[PDB]
């Protein structure tokens, strides 16, 4: 494995792009820029390059930093995703991008929900203290013409400071950690991410079940009650009896009210549940990256756990053993700084989306109650 | 058929109990007593008569008229039901009584919902201007000992003023109706009752469907969401990250709130739907009596429609033909007076039960909204 390269590398290799890690008040963290920018993904429009009419959708990117816009076709984002995974993937979870829908990819349904999840993906990256400060990300947003875009697309594709070698560009400003503490930190992360992954999968499951229920069978029930009340009122209207127009009208409206409720019920998920599910979908994406990041860290600890045997059988020197110990310590610091970034955002994201979901639900039931109250006020008293 | 007896009877038969019918402002109606009483069915307790311990539940009846109470076992009500059907059944719908449940008939579940529907049944009878003034009904409520109850149980069982002969005790205070008008009135009633019967069956159907849905699958969905939120919060509580007790507690409560909602959802039908269904159940009972009442009236019109042939072939005299015409006219008046009593109460009953149902539903959704609002107020803002 290349993991050995990093731990045993001749290394005297002074880095170009340095990534600092510091110990704040509660654990090792990344260094956050005073000014945090975001990027707007919008204004989709067709593009060309001597093609014809197999025109491709090309989105516009406007960082709220310098408000200077550049364009990018989907393929370009996929390209950045791969470069980020290659370069930072062993240390930072890189949420994957959406896929290819149905071959009608040229209107609202497609390019809008896409421009939707692409916007979320770009925001995460823009807000990441390491990713957003990388050359490949900076140059992806700030290039003036096909000359820069092509030159930047080359040095990035050829940056061998990737995989596990990324840790060699990190400089933790704290003491070295002993192997015991390192192994436990790694084990704890492995355990938490796995538990949450299950917890997140469970929520996404009941979610879709309740979704297919609010758009299928439930709306049909209020629908049946409402037509049943109308059929009845219609029969009543033909009784020939007097002074009934009063009631029958109220009954016909109550039936129509239940129909409006059926439709409101079928359209509610898009206002609340939808968001809860998206947040969880994105988190499964993040959590899906940990099995490999933990594998890399675990693999590193194993190698170091053999350094003594290696020094004993003279396979390596005493200096080399310490370099391994020093380097694996840095990996631990990166894992903890990323885990800190993750927890911080997890708390904020779940607090927001659950508040949002609850607020919408409250509004939903109050609205149903108001509609029922209106139908009631139309019934004569006795 | 005995129908011929009534139309062709030697009749000079002056009646004992006279039933008046008058033409109010909108159609022929019964004569309603200035003072309307009702009867309370309650205080169930065991009874004997040299049996042992196969004790039978004996209810107490207290008409709010003279507040003097008498007792009656179920069998006694079944007895009155049959006597009323025999005597008035050809003119007035007699809603049937409940049946026999499970052989554990000695506690709440049984004798309470029974005492429930028995109370409704007694009220209908008490409020009926003809039934409540009949001897068999009066004596069923006002008897002092086993001597009167046995003597009253005999003359009633032997009252031959029943079946179609009941119309001979009716005295409509209006002009005779011609056969044409009679046949149309009969046809109209036949048609309305059939249409409403279908309309009522439809409501009872969607009703039970929505009932088995509010106690089965729907409660389980809010149940799953609520446990799913708790599993997630529990995972979050083990992140080791700081200042999170805040959120996680709110999440655990939101999950518990959905559980309280599940239970509230499963218990809602008993507060609203239940009543809508009972009202419709009782009306199916009434409507179930019309096929035979209309059959009797239709059969009567057919016989009269042959009176001319009978006078021509000298099978009957001219006087007899007119008596037929006079008597069938009275039947028409009774049908119209009963139909008036029915429509009047139908309007009042459906207006009340639907208002009741709507009010409870409004309260239900507002309650759900309040519970969701409470869980929301527990989430820290950001």
UniProtKB/Swiss-Prot annotation, chains A, B:
Phosphotyrosine found at: 26
Phosphothreonine, modified sites: 3
Entry note about domains: The PX domain mediates interaction with membranes enriched in phosphatidylinositol phosphate. Has high affinity for phosphatidylinositol 4,5-bisphosphate, but can also bind to membranes enriched in other phosphatidylinositol phosphates.
Organism: Homo sapiens (Human)
Key words, A-Z: Acetylation, Cell cycle, Cell division, Cell membrane, Cell projection, Cytoplasm, Cytoplasmic vesicle, Endocytosis, Golgi apparatus, Lipid-binding, Membrane, Mitosis, Phosphoprotein, Protein transport, SH3 domain, Transport, Ubl conjugation
Quaternary state and interactors: Homodimer, and homooligomer. Heterodimer with SNX18. Interacts with ITCH. Interacts (via SH3 domain) with TNK2, WASL and ACTR3. Identified in a complex with TNK2 and clathrin heavy chains. Identified in a complex with the AP-2 complex, clathrin and DNM2. Interacts (via SH3 domain) with DNM1 and DNM2. Identified in an oligomeric complex containing DNM1 and SNX9. Interacts with FCHSD1. Interacts with ADAM9 and ADAM15 cytoplasmic tails.
Stated role: Involved in endocytosis and intracellular vesicle trafficking, both during interphase and at the end of mitosis. Required for efficient progress through mitosis and cytokinesis. Required for normal formation of the cleavage furrow at the end of mitosis. Plays a role in endocytosis via clathrin-coated pits, but also clathrin-independent, actin-dependent fluid-phase endocytosis. Plays a role in macropinocytosis. Promotes internalization of TNFR. Promotes degradation of EGFR after EGF signaling. Stimulates the GTPase activity of DNM1. Promotes DNM1 oligomerization.
Transferase among keywords: no
Listed GO CC annotations: clathrin-coated pit; clathrin-coated vesicle; cuticular plate; cytoplasm; cytoplasmic vesicle; cytoplasmic vesicle membrane; cytosol; extracellular exosome
Keyword Acetylation included in the entry's annotation: yes
Protein name (database record): Sorting nexin-9
Tissues/organs with expression: Widely expressed, with highest levels in heart and placenta, and lowest levels in thymus and peripheral blood leukocytes.
Protein family per UniProt: Belongs to the sorting nexin family.
Interval of the full protein contained in this chain: 214 to 595 of 595
Name of the coding gene: SNX9
Gene Ontology MF, one: Arp2/3 complex binding
PTM entry text: Ubiquitinated by ITCH.
Protein's membrane topology: Peripheral membrane protein
Protein localization: Cytoplasmic vesicle membrane; Cell membrane; Cytoplasmic vesicle, Clathrin-coated vesicle; Golgi apparatus, trans-Golgi network
Binding locations of a 1,2-diacyl-sn-glycero-3-phospho-(1D-myo-inositol-4,5-bisphosphate): 73, 75, 114
